A paper describes a structure:
Using time-resolved cryogenic-electron microscopy, we captured a complete series of structural snapshots of gating and catalytic cycles, revealing the coupling mechanism between channel gating and enzymatic activity. The slow kinetics of the NUDT9-H enzyme module confers a self-regulatory mechanism: ADPR binding triggers NUDT9-H tetramerization, promoting channel opening, while subsequent hydrolysis reduces local ADPR, inducing channel closure. The structures of srTRPM2 exhibit a characteristic [name] architecture, from top to bottom, a transmembrane domain (TMD) layer containing the ion-conducting pore, a signal transduction layer consisting of MHR3/4 domain and the C-terminal rib helix, and an ADPR-sensing layer consisting of the N-terminal MHR1/2 domain and the C-terminal NUDT9-H domain.
A cation binding site is found between the MHR3/4 domain and the Rib helix of each subunit, termed MgMHR. Replacing E1114 with alanine eliminated cation binding at MgMHR, resulting in a reduced rotational movement of the intracellular domain around the symmetry axis when ligands were bound, as compared to the wild-type (WT) protein. However, single-channel analysis showed a small decrease in channel open probability and a small increase in channel close rate, revealing a regulatory role of this cation binding site on channel gating.
Author numbering:
A (entry chain D): 676 to 723
B (entry chain C): 628 to 723
C (entry chain D): 483 to 532, 546 to 627
D (entry chain D), E (entry chain C): 917 to 1061
F (entry chain D): 1110 to 1157
G (entry chain A): 1062 to 1157
H (entry chain A): 724 to 756, 787 to 916
Amino acid sequence: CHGSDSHMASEMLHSKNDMFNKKNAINIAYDAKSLAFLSHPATQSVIN
Amino acid sequence: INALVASRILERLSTHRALQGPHLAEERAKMQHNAKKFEELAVGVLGECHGSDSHMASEMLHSKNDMFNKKNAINIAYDAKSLAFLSHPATQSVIN
Amino acid sequence: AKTNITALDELPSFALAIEELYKREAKKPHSHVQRLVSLSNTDVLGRHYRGRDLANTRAYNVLRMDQIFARLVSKDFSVNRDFTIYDSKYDKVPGIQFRRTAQASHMLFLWAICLDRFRMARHFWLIGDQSI
Amino acid sequence: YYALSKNLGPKLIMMMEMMKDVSTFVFLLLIFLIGYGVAAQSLLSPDEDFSSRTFIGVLFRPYFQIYGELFLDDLNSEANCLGDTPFTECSRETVRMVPFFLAVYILGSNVLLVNLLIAMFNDTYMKVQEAAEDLWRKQNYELCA
Amino acid sequence: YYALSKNLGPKLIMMMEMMKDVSTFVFLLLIFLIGYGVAAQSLLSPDEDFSSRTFIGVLFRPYFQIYGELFLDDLNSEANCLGDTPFTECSRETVRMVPFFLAVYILGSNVLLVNLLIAMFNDTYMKVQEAAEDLWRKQNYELCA
Amino acid sequence: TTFEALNTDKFLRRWERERQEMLEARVKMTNDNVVQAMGMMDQLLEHM
Amino acid sequence: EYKDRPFLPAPFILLAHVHMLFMRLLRLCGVHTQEHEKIQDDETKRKITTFEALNTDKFLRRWERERQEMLEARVKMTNDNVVQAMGMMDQLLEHM
Amino acid sequence: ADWYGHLKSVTSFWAVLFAFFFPFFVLPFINFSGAHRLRRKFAKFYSAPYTRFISDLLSHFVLCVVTSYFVLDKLEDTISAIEWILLVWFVALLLEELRQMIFCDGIAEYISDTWNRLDLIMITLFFVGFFTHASDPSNQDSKVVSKGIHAFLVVVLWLRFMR
Ligand SMILES: CC(C)CCC[C@@H](C)[C@H]1CC[C@H]2[C@@H]3CC=C4C[C@@H](O)CC[C@]4(C)[C@H]3CC[C@]12C
Ligand SMILES: CC(C)CCC[C@@H](C)[C@H]1CC[C@H]2[C@@H]3CC=C4C[C@@H](O)CC[C@]4(C)[C@H]3CC[C@]12C
Ligand SMILES: CC(C)CCC[C@@H](C)[C@H]1CC[C@H]2[C@@H]3CC=C4C[C@@H](O)CC[C@]4(C)[C@H]3CC[C@]12C
Ligand SMILES: CC(C)CCC[C@@H](C)[C@H]1CC[C@H]2[C@@H]3CC=C4C[C@@H](O)CC[C@]4(C)[C@H]3CC[C@]12C
Ligand SMILES: CC(C)CCC[C@@H](C)[C@H]1CC[C@H]2[C@@H]3CC=C4C[C@@H](O)CC[C@]4(C)[C@H]3CC[C@]12C
Ligand SMILES: CC(C)CCC[C@@H](C)[C@H]1CC[C@H]2[C@@H]3CC=C4C[C@@H](O)CC[C@]4(C)[C@H]3CC[C@]12C
Ligand SMILES: [Mg+2]
């Protein structure tokens, strides 16, 4: 996703999903204790 | 000289104001990578020269080129911040 | 067999097939799935309230499993299911076959996560959407 | 607030990881400190009733002698030895063993345990440097949130 | 003029690289030094007006105690404790906590931070040794020019 | 949703291509091809 | 070490010592006891023997399969197959 | 599994230590494995190697603290009560060492372990110091020589505590 279109990937990461009471994928990743996802440059770019 | 110029232009473009942006990161990386590769090429050709005839290679490294206001290739390499070219035994032999 | 619960009776055939798959997997000796269901302490709808015949003949339904997986993941998982789209009256809708596929794959995906069959899990993950 | 910085934050995470090694060092050091302190305190001042000062004497000098500040002048004064050479011509012959016990003790603490702690720190550092960077990126999100 | 030599020059480049790690150590050390110094200075001499001497007392002893020179005799003299055992029979009972704070402090500085600095130096050395040699060959050209 | 499913398909194609370019996989695939080649030679010898 | 040692701690282990001494005196002089002895049936012994030989065979099959999946073995086996393939081509050329 | 005996593997150091200190208040409310019920639970919990190992540690820790207290406190003009308690304690330790000597796989196997050698040094130092003091209890010099020997014992018992 970050390779194809970084801005569209950022829009994807900022998108609220109904399945976890309307909050985004990074919160889900933090709740899942996924260290690898959080350390990725795309996720870090969205956080910055 | 073309490999040093190519390495310098890609390195300067990778930190230029026109290349900063969230979507340009991979592009920047690619430029830096290509720069490094060209630097390696410049070392390789230089190494071949030193392998064939070291004295003639020294004459080549001491030759003044008109394209950078009449001064030699080692000054060009220093200006291009090419650490690999400067650390080569042929270049070090000319400096010694 | 027919059931008095309206929530259980609205469920399609493939959901009962996944329930049959869970039952078949559960019937094997020393299976961790049966231990998880027994330790969960929930009713037929998966609600944390802890008759008996309905609670034993249909102990491995998909809603209860959804509640158990929901409690394992986080504090706010609530999957919204719509089994009304599997009726023949919604056939004229263009994109319904993708959604219908996705939902089905998702339920089977969760079943494949429960039995720790990584290859099926990966395959059901491929067919559906919301990969990440 | 050091966690925002790319240098101070992962080093802080590595320091919190070392704390277990520091605690391990404290547990190993406790054996020599209590043993040498009770033994040395009894040898320096015998025939004395137990009090709170005895316990303070057990704890005070042994702990601070492993950092190189030796109380040998103070121990020489407490031993009541009047000779020009320090642990000679004493009233009791047993108190002359006080530097010998110490000789074993600082060999146990500085020569052996401190260098072992250095080895544990280098190994621990190499093991958890990448994990500290990953955990720092997670704590970056934690600060942002 | 050490840069011409094949031994002293790359080691100087490595030393300039370490300076960031030294600065990092100073930033970590500053927390304990200022905190322990203000706390310890207040405990030793209470009910005193603030002056420049208070600030000098905050900065002077904590910094030099991490290199093993302990001022325990000087702290004992300032605490006005007249007992044979040093931190006993004092006018105020709070000043007897002065060695305990110190006990935490040098554990923080010598046991924890210094050994961590040793680990950073070994890792940093292994990372930038080849780069130091390459940079030395560039500085060789710089001297020649 | 369309972007994410396209990038999912793209990653699977790239991952499959990368796993086929490994040395172990190439040696195994080359080995099976050489086994089938021996089978075809047996068929050729039968025709002879 | 701690399986055969008595349970009772050090000030109170004298009671345990005199209890063991009392049992030793009752067994040697008195001969009023006969301890405890438990055996195992032949069925479970043959079950352990059958299980162990099956797992031995399973490990040998897995070990053989693992040694055939190594890169060196595959290259060597591939090489011998290519040598036999050349032999079959020589036979084919003879037929031609 | 042999270590925990008939007990669940999730048991911690503090839980078993608390159950040892409070037998009638922590044992019925724990999960593991009438006269034949209470006796069965007591025989299962206390037959485990882990509980006796924890008891031996705690016992050796008390021995170190009490013996350390004994060496720091002044000797009396006769043999004190704490000296008699420590004498009974070290005989018991000596009998345990003899039991270890008889029931092992030879004298060589026993003496191979460094901790058994340390145990012999403990018993030898204590008896020399005790007989040195007990030879002339009113003599000040005997007390001084005895405390000098007993400094070495405290050093070995804290070293022996690392086992
Ligand atoms: C194996 C190790 C731990 C045991 C070491 C032996 C110790 C306990 C023995 C060996 C020699 C002994 C010393 C010999 C002579 C004297 C002089 C006397 O006026 C006071 C006691 C004193 C100072 C003895 C103290 C105890 C002593 C140090
Ligand atoms: C215990 C192991 C490590 C080694 C044993 C060495 C011990 C027993 C030795 C080494 C140094 C010795 C001391 C050296 C000097 C003197 C002064 C003398 O007038 C009385 C004995 C006395 C006080 C000795 C007692 C025994 C001693 C402490
Ligand atoms: C390489 C190193 C380990 C050498 C070993 C040093 C040993 C042998 C030396 C260093 C300091 C010495 C002690 C210094 C002072 C005294 C007091 C004196 O009244 C008796 C001997 C005694 C107790 C010495 C015993 C031997 C001693 C412990
Ligand atoms: C969690 C940590 C940081 C808190 C530690 C508790 C501190 C603040 C408390 C606990 C016990 C307290 C001490 C208890 C008794 C006395 C004696 C009194 O004559 C002077 C104050 C003094 C010396 C107190 C000072 C404050 C004290 C040390
Ligand atoms: C803060 C954490 C790390 C541990 C807490 C330990 C603190 C609160 C303890 C440890 C040592 C203690 C001190 C030890 C001795 C004395 C002398 C007494 O007459 C008054 C209290 C005083 C001055 C104590 C105050 C509290 C103290 C400082
Ligand atoms: C293994 C290491 C960490 C052991 C820990 C050492 C601790 C427990 C010891 C070492 C030095 C000791 C301090 C030394 C002196 C004094 C002054 C006295 O008036 C009160 C107690 C107090 C403040 C002590 C408290 C406990 C203390 C801090
Ligand atoms: Mg033993």
